[PDB]
Amino acid sequence: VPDYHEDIHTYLREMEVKCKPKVGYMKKQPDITNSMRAILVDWLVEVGEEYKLQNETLHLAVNYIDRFLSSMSVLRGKLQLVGTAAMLLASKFEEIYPPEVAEFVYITDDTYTKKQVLRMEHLVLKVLTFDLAAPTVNQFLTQYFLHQQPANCKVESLAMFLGELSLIDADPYLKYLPSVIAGAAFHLALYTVTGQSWPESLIRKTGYTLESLKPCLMDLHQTYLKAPQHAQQSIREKYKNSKYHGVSLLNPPETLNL
Amino acid sequence: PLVDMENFQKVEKIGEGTYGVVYKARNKLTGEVVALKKIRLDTETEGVPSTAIREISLLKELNHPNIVKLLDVIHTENKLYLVFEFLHQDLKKFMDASALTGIPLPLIKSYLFQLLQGLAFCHSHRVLHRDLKPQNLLINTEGAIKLADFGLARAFGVPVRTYTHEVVTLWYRAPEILLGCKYYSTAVDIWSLGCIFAEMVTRRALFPGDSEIDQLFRIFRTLGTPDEVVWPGVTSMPDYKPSFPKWARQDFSKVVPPLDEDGRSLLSQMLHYDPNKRISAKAALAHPFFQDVTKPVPHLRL
Numbered sequence: 427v428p429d430y431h432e433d434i435h436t437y438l439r440e441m442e443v444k445c446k447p448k449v450g451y452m453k454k455q456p457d458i459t460n461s462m463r464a465i466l467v468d469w470l471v472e473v474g475e476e477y478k479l480q481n482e483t484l485h486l487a488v489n490y491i492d493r494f495l496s497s498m499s500v501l502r503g504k505l506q507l508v509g510t511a512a513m514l515l516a517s518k519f520e521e522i523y524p525p526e527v528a529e530f531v532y533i534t535d536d537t538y539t540k541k542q543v544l545r546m547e548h549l550v551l552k553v554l555t556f557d558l559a560a561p562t563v564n565q566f567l568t569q570y571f572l573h574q575q576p577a578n579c580k581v582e583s584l585a586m587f588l589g590e591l592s593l594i595d596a597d598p599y600l601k602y603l604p605s606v607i608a609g610a611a612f613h614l615a616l617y618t619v620t621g622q623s624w625p626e627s628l629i630r631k632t633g634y635t636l637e638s639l640k641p642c643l644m645d646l647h648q649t650y651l652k653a654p655q656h657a658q659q660s661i662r663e664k665y666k667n668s669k670y671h672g673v674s675l676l677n678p679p680e681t682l683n684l
Numbered sequence: 685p686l687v688d689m690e691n692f693q694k695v696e697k698i699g700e701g702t703y704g705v706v707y708k709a710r711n712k713l714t715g716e717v718v719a720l721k722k723i724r725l726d727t728e729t730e731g732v733p734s735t736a737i738r739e740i741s742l743l744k745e746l747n748h749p750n751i752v753k754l755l756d757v758i759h760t761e762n763k764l765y766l767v768f769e770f771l772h773q774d775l776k777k778f779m780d781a782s783a784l785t786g787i788p789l790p791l792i793k794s795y796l797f798q799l800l801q802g803l804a805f806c807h808s809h810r811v812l813h814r815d816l817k818p819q820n821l822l823i824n825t826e827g828a829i830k831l832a833d834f835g836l837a838r839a840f841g842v843p844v845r846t847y848t849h850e851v852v853t854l855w856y857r858a859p860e861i862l863l864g865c866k867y868y869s870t871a872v873d874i875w876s877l878g879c880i881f882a883e884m885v886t887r888r889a890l891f892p893g894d895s896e897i898d899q900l901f902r903i904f905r906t907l908g909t910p911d912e913v914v915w916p917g918v919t920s921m922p923d924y925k926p927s928f929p930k931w932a933r934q935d936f937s938k939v940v941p942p943l944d945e946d947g948r949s950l951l952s953q954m955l956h957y958d959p960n961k962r963i964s965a966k967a968a969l970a971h972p973f974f975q976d977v978t979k980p981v982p983h984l985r986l
């Protein structure tokens with residue numbers, strides 16, 4: 427129970443509306459698709475496990491990417507350069523000790539040069555106007571967690587898992603605000619582990635009712651159901667580790683009782 | 685980019701360090717006076733330093749009268765310039781120049797009031813400063829003071845973890861940090877401000893430690909060795925030691941003799957051991973100590 431807790435939620439709710447990517451940017455892109463993007467993010471998830479980076483770093487880099495692609499035409503063979511630069515910036519902003527550029531060149535199979543990565547860092551920064559402190563699903567989950575009765579590490583791990591998956595698929599998740607994705611991931615995880623639902627305290631905090639969360643919820647539930655069939659698997663693998671209580675192995679309900 | 689640099693006329697070098705250099709300068713077209721912070725990039729060719737990333741990104745969210753304004757960023761191929769408003773002096777040098785007279789108590793009060801306002805704004809915007817020391821507090825002739833240097837600052841929508849290297853200098857470091865706590869909280873900034881309040885009042889640093897263990901024992905010797913009642917958990921904390929000397933709390937009116945009851949109360953609450961009990965910037969602003977606050981102008985020996 428923090429001091430500026432309320433003022434912060436309100437501020438993040440403001441900033442998430444301003445850092446919002448262009449919903450339908452992918453189709454105005456000449457060369458890349460939602461699928462290529464999904465492959466890219468799944469790759470970065472992998473990259474974060476390799477260098478033991480925070481989950482917030484991953485969410486931030488994805489925010490940077492969607493925003494850059496919101497305004498810049500990118501070609502297939504340069505897409506991963508954008509993604510690598512986003513991760514580098516994300517690490518510098520969020521990590522205590524970021525990996526060195528040499529590592530970021532290495533993890534690309536020398537498809538790009540140290541020089542290319544550094545120039546792209548400049549161009550990403552220019553395109554984003556140095557606005558790196560973006561609101562993420564994680565930030566809203568952290569806020570929501572304080573409202574656990576009691577805390578359940580399983581519920582927390584599972585909500586993280588659901589939020590992380592939502593990064594992978596620009597459709598349908600680009601059209602939902604982080605605070606909303608967070609709301610759905612929290613309820614779904616809560617319902618699965620404990621059979622409880624979106625608490626009254628959070629309805630007062632957020633203004634979100636289970637009703638308003640519904641559309642994102644139905645989408646998220648499907649993504650949880652079809653999760654093991656999905657072409658991208660790095661996240662599910664990450665989350666069967668004991669560090670996350672194996673929540674990527676829990677069986678989802680077959681229906682949410684709405 | 686280079687059009688922009690040629691519109692500046694360098695006046696004089698006003699600061700230098702591991703970070704780079706700071707020049708006072710003039711806009712040749714508008715006449716605006718300005719501070720140019722120059723960061724060399726070819727020194728590690730590791731790209732834009734993390735310290736500029738955080739300062740630039742965070743500072744351009746924070747618009748407040750007691751936070752230094754970042755005016756512009758100019759990025760050439762080998763240099764990075766941040767353009768800031770200019771202020772005449774910093775608190776370290778002003779305290780030093782005031783050694784014989786002391787800083788008048790009404791000016792001390794105004795300064796602390798302003799610093800808390802700036803810090804409240806930071807915190808209510810999920811920014812931790814993390815390096816509040818007299819040298820990063822800037823002042824002008826009209827009587828304002830502003831938080832500066834956000835190179836170690838951090839957004840905390842997600843909780844911020846402890847780094848050994850990236851820390852407040854020793855004299856202003858909170859006890860939780862010395863004792864090895866996991867996360868920073870806003871409480872660590874309030875601790876720093878409390879140390880500075882005391883130094884302004886007494887003309888000496890509150891806790892001038894030689895090392896981490898010495899810094900702790902100086903705090904313990906003044907404030908009392910904390911116990912489980914004072915601070916639930918202390919004995920559990922990583923770097924706590926059962927072999928610690930058990931000092932009694934010193935009489936607080938003998939630690940800051942020039943202060944009245946209201947001042948003593950405020951500083952007690954700013955130096956509370958338990959981070960959760962330590963007063964917040966917003967709540968400190970309501971303390972009766974600020975009943976009568978005014979805005980005096982300093983004698984700047986410029």
Ligand SMILES: CC(C)CC(=O)Nc1n[nH]c2c1CN(C(=O)C1CCN(C)CC1)C2(C)C
Nearest residue numbers: 698699719768769770771772773774832833
């Ligand atoms: C000459 C000093 C007494 C005063 C002085 O340098 N004032 C300033 N006006 N504007 C600025 C500073 C000092 N500035 C700084 O960014 C410096 C703050 C102190 N740290 C240790 C290095 C960076 C900016 C905001 C650019």
